[PDB]
Design a protein around this motif. Structure first.
Motif, PDB file in Angstrom:
ATOM      1  N   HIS A 120       0.828  -1.200   0.000  1.00  0.00           N
ATOM      2  CA  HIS A 120       0.000   0.000   0.000  1.00  0.00           C
ATOM      3  C   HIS A 120       0.866   1.254   0.000  1.00  0.00           C
ATOM      4  N   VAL A 121       0.294   2.363  -0.463  1.00  0.00           N
ATOM      5  CA  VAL A 121       0.989   3.645  -0.489  1.00  0.00           C
ATOM      6  C   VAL A 121       0.106   4.689   0.181  1.00  0.00           C
ATOM      7  N   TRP A 122      -0.799   4.238   1.043  1.00  0.00           N
ATOM      8  CA  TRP A 122      -1.815   5.079   1.654  1.00  0.00           C
ATOM      9  C   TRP A 122      -1.506   5.265   3.137  1.00  0.00           C
ATOM     10  N   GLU A 123      -2.418   5.927   3.840  1.00  0.00           N
ATOM     11  CA  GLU A 123      -2.386   6.032   5.297  1.00  0.00           C
ATOM     12  C   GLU A 123      -3.660   5.342   5.772  1.00  0.00           C
TER      13      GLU A 123
END
Lengths: 31, 105, 36, 379, 421
Positions: C10-13
């Motif tokens: 993932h590259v999210w928060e």
């Protein structure tokens, strides 16, 4: 509190400058 | 072309009448306001909720006892604002001090 | 700088609620309206 | 620009690669038609391997032979250009070869050919076109690393020099990538900035772009900005006139007709989960919109009863209580339940109270940083 | 001869490292000759890198070419390699390389030589090198897997180093002694010692972090959850950023456990961190199970990952977990409600009976995790009447603590301001 925070930050900046100057002076004197 | 303008005029007039009839109060019954303005309780409640959400006047509803607590909101203290932006400025100054020291010592 | 080699090594928060498993909101709403 | 690759193929493939949707066979018909038309042997093989489908060896061999014929023809033309023609036509032949590799779906081969073409070429416009091809391939394959690398490259090229059209197309690509990576705020910014001048028809149709912009803008924008730039948006209104459901959904949210809003949110969740770009975001989007509706309703009240909430939202008191409890626990609402006499008080923090709490938090962060500095340096 | 070329490049690197050692040594002479009983810290700051880059031939040539001032102590170094502070620092490098070679027997013999020498020389500028030697000797006896006589000897050394008003040595000895007590599970004695001792207020950041970690462990196992959590968070903050992966992982694990015990939920960012994701994944599963409140999931994850649970040590805390699992349930039930009834609490927490729910909420009052009243005349748990907390002394107290801290930082900075002339 905001005033004291600013004053402390300024003091730390002054100390950083003093450390840099002292190290530069000692290095130059040694060399 | 006429219906839309007339509806907008109706809404504006309803807003103005609500302001006029609610000014001489600090806590009113939505039933009393509806009786004064000659509308229905549900419609006046929905219009009041929309006005409050859009910040047309300083008041909060209460669908329980059926009340509209109007008041004056104290102006936002600008001192805490200026303090917060100054805190941000000092945070980025501390970042600069890191970049200086931790890299020159 | 000093280092703690003593302690063995993932590259999210994303958000906690995200992992929660539940029916799709469409199905939930359909059920709610069917029983309402 | 051309649809090379055509993201509709990725749309259809992803739609097929989903439970309770495999075997509809309309997706299969359309995808097979497109694959046969564009002669995508590597993509056909990859799809069959990944999804365990049968292989029509006859057509596979026929179209593989066609693909080899085309590849050999392109290589022969490139060799002739190198032997006789100058660097300009050599670059043109490389450009055509990369085009054809992308058309057939050769991911790595197309990447290598495009890298060679970019390295050789010097024209600014051709460099922009090559990097845009790279970005489109990156979106096609959902490779975040390549997408962001090419995005940085294209931004650097534009900064070094560029024009209005390529700037807009880069804006649209950035918006697509942001929607992919859940940066709905920046996605709303870019989509609303570029809505009036949409030109990247190679990614989607204007109607799909408008629906994406409406969704993203509503999830990323407060009430004032939403009203100013969507409800009062000329192009958005024009397209929403043709789109009768998205208009319903947005206007239900704005006018605070919450039951219609929830129905529209359900249908929009289903559509957005079917979608390929938004696919790993529908749960988050629905949760955010539920929180948004609850906050909007409670913004103009101090004591709201679960009966009235259920009536307004067209749901049951039990469901409203469950959702309110979950969101309050998660900390996404300023309201306290009271079950004995069903009520929801609104404990919104006063302006001064919130300012004090924000000051405490920011000061704690800054003071931790200052303590770290002081203790590191004084020693 | 690629091997010959690599050897020549390695020897050039050896010359560079020898020049670095000369630089550190001359810094030591400058420190001893002048005031500011420091710059030994400057010399040691590269100690980890120098130890990493050490080499057998490097050390052999160093011992061969140095120690020429006097003494034949090079007979204790040359066979195994085939001044007031310089001897100590070179010898410390030698013993570190011996540890890297993993020859624990002569490592400990040579360390005992160090230890006798430093005990004999009662100097004041040698305290930092002595502390580093003490740490590395604790480590060599850990590698030897004895850690038995270290207790007594480091205890005596700590007594000497606190009779002498030293800070770095005091902190290092205390940290090593607490580590020994924990490794042998002597939590009671560790608690007594930390209660009856004082950590040097001005100590190295690493030693501060170690002391907070150990004290947090003591408090957590001693039933002081709030103190354990705050101390552990402070330790994590103090710890380095781009290193100490193992220490950070241990701190994160124990902090996550103690938070779950307190009744809160850890931040998902911890788990999302790449350096900690794989290590903490079992604790991610545990956190998910507790948040869901599913005893079956809790039990199955415990059974699956019992191995890591001895690897780190949490079992008593992991059953205290189940306790605070029900505690977290009740805390959230009171957090997202204001006048909930006992029957509703029982229904939502799946508790057997309203009387059981009443007992559980009373214990929540014990732990102070709900801060709410209750009335059994009608059977519902009222909450504290929330007050607008700005017309009261809480903001004054918070701002007072922060103002005092800022004044203290200014004072410490303007005192550390130094002029070498």
């Amino acid at each position: 509190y905001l005033a004291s925070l600013i004053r402390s930050v300024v003091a730390l900046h002054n100390l950083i400058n003093n450390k840099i100057a002292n190290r530069d002076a000692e290095k130059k004197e040694g060399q | 072309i006429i219906s839309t303008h007339l509806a907008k005029l109706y809404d504006n007039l309803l807003e103005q009448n609500l302001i006029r009839v609610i000014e001489p109060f600090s806590r009113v019954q939505i039933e009393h306001i509806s009786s004064l303005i000659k509308l229905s309780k549900a419609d006046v409640e929905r219009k009041l909720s929309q006005m409050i959400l859009d910040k047309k006047f300083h008041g909060i509803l209460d669908q329980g006892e059926g009340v509209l607590i109007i008041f004056d909101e104290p102006p936002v203290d600008k001192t805490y604002e200026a303090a917060l932006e100054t805190i941000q400025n000092m945070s980025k100054v501390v970042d600069s001090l890191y970049n200086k020291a931790k890299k020159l010592t | 700088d000093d280092e703690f080699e003593e302690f063995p090594a993932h590259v999210w928060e994303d958000n906690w609620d995200d992992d929660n498993v539940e029916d799709d909101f469409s199905n939930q709403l359909r059920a709610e309206l069917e029983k309402h | 620009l051309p649809k090379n690759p055509d993201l509709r193929i990725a749309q259809l493939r992803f739609l097929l690669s989903l439970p309770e949707h495999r075997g509809d066979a309309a997706v299969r018909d359309e995808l097979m038609a497109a694959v046969r038309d564009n002669n995508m042997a590597p993509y056909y093989e990859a799809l069959c391997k990944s999804l365990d489908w049968q292989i029509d060896v006859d057509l596979l061999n026929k179209m593989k032979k066609a693909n080899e014929d085309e590849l050999k023809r392109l290589d022969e033309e490139l060799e002739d250009a190198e032997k006789n023609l100058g660097e300009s036509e050599i670059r043109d032949a490389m450009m055509a070869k990369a085009e054809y590799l992308c058309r057939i779906g050769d991911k790595e081969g197309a990447l290598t050919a495009f890298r060679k073409t970019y390295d050789k070429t010097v024209a600014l416009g051709h460099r922009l076109d090559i990097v845009f091809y790279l970005l489109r391939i990156g979106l096609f394959y959902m490779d975040n690393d390549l997408i962001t690398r090419n995005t940085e490259k294209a931004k650097s090229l534009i900064e070094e020099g560029g024009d209005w059209d390529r700037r807009n197309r880069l804006k649209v690509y950035q918006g697509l990538y942001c929607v992919a990576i859940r940066d709905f705020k920046q996605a709303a910014e870019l989509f609303l900035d570029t809505v009036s001048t949409f030109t990247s028809y190679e990614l989607m149709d204007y109607k799909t772009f408008v629906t994406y912009t409406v969704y993203v803008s509503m999830i990323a924008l407060e009430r004032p900005d939403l009203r100013e730039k969507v409800i009062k948006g000329a192009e958005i209104l024009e397209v929403l006139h043709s789109l009768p459901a998205v208009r319903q959904y947005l206007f239900s949210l704005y006018e605070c007709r919450y039951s219609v809003f929830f129905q529209s949110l359900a249908v929009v969740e289903q559509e957005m989960k079917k979608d390929w770009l938004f696919a790993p975001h529908y749960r988050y989007y629905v949760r955010e919109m539920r929180i948004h509706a609850y906050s909007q309703l409670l913004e103009s009240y101090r004591s709201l009863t679960l009966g009235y909430m259920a009536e307004a939202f067209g749901v049951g008191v039990e469901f409203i209580d469950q959702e309110l409890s979950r969101f309050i626990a998660a900390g996404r609402l300023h309201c306290k339940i009271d079950k004995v006499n069903e009520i929801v008080e609104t404990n919104r923090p006063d302006s001064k109270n919130w300012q004090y709490q924000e000051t405490i938090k920011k000061g704690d962060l800054l003071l931790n940083r200052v303590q770290k500095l002081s203790r590191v340096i004084n020693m | 001869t690629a091997a010959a070329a690599a050897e020549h490049s390695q020897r050039e690197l050896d010359t560079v490292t020898l020049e670095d050692i000369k630089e550190h040594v001359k810094q030591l002479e400058k420190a001893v000759s002048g005031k500011e009983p420091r710059f030994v810290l400057r010399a040691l700051r590269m100690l980890p890198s120098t130890s990493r880059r050490l080499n057998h031939y490097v050390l052999y040539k160093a011992v061969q070419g140095f120690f020429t001032s006097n003494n034949a102590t090079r007979d204790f170094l040359l066979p195994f390699l085939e001044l007031p502070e310089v001897e100590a620092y070179l010898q410390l490098l030698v013993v570190i390389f011996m540890m890297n070679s993993k020859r624990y027997k002569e490592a400990q013999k040579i360390s005992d030589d160090l230890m006798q020498k430093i005990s004999t020389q009662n100097r004041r500028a040698l305290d930092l090198v002595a502390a580093k030697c003490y740490y590395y000797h604790a480590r060599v006896y850990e590698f030897l897997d004895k850690l038995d006589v270290v207790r007594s000897f480091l205890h005596a050394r700590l007594r000497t180093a606190t009779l002498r008003h030293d800070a770095d040595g005091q902190a290092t000895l205390l940290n090593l002694l607490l580590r020994n007590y924990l490794h042998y599970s002597l939590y009671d004695q560790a608690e007594k010692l930390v209660s009856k001792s004082v950590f040097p207020e001005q100590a190295n950041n690493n030693e501060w972090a170690r002391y907070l970690y150990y004290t947090g462990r003591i408090k957590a196992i001693q039933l002081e959850y709030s103190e354990a959590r705050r101390t552990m968070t402070n330790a994590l903050r103090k710890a380095p950023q781009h290193t100490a992966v193992g220490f950070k992982q241990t701190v994160h694990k124990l902090l996550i456990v103690v938070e779950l015990l307190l009744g809160e939920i850890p931040d998902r960012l911890q788990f999302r961190q790449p350096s900690l994701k794989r290590s903490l994944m079992p604790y991610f599963l545990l956190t998910q199970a507790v948040r869901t409140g599913n005893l079956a999931k809790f039990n199955q994850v415990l059974d699956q990952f019992g191995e890591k649970f001895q690897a780190d040590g949490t079992y008593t805390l992991i059953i205290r977990l189940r306790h605070n699992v029900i505690k977290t349930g009740v805390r959230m039930i009171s957090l997202s409600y204001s006048r909930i009834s006992l029957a509703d609490i029982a229904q939502k927490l799946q508790l057997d009976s309203p009387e059981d729910a009443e007992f559980i909420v009373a214990k929540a009052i014990r732990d102070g995790v709900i801060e709410a009243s209750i009335n059994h005349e009608k059977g519902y748990v009222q909450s504290k009447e929330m007050i607008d907390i700005y017309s009261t002394r809480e903001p004054q107290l918070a701002f007072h603590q922060r103002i005092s801290f800022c004044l203290d930082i200014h004072n410490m900075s303007v005192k550390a301001m130094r002029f070498p002339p």
